Amino acid sequence: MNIFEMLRIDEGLRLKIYKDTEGYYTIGIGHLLTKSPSLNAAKSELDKAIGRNTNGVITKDEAEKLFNQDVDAAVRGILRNAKLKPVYDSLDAVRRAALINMVFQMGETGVAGFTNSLRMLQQKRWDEAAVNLAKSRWYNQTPNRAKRVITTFRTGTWDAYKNL
Numbered sequence: 001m002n003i004f005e006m007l008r009i010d011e012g013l014r015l016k017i018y019k020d021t022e023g024y025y026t027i028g029i030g031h032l033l034t035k036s037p038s039l040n041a042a043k044s045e046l047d048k049a050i051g052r053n054t055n056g057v058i059t060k061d062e063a064e065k066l067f068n069q070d071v072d073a074a075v076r077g078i079l080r081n082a083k084l085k086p087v088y089d090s091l092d093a094v095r096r097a098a099l100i101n102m103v104f105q106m107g108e109t110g111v112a113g114f115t116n117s118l119r120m121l122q123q124k125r126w127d128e129a130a131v132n133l134a135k136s137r138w139y140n141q142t143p144n145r146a147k148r149v150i151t152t153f154r155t156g157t158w159d160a161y162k163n164l
Ligand SMILES: [Cl-]
Pocket: 141, 142, 143, 144, 145, 146
């Protein structure tokens, strides 16, 4: 198990424009297109991202290309952010993937707002971090995904993603 397989479990794969859990236009493996309510705006973003006239459908290879770019960007976002980088550097490899998962879902700014949870992670108070992370809109809106990520921070294993 690695970060690509993990996010593929959490995000799924769809080759046509769809709305995500928040109602936003999305394609591929959780690639957000736009927060605008206009499908035309979303189709224009898609064509710009892919570089051809797609008419709202992409291939699996195109979806995997956007996915590689998005994972790369999440990592680079962590390492550039002064609040996230010291956390990431303090973590083992499994828990690093859990942090990347959160940044992929909610962005660098969103995760950098979990101030108290990040401090607990850095101190390696895993049970206390797990409790604090669950006191969040994130946990209440997407509880099955949040549980899996939180379990990964608590245990430092992939057990939440096996049998899936
Ligand atoms: Cl969920």
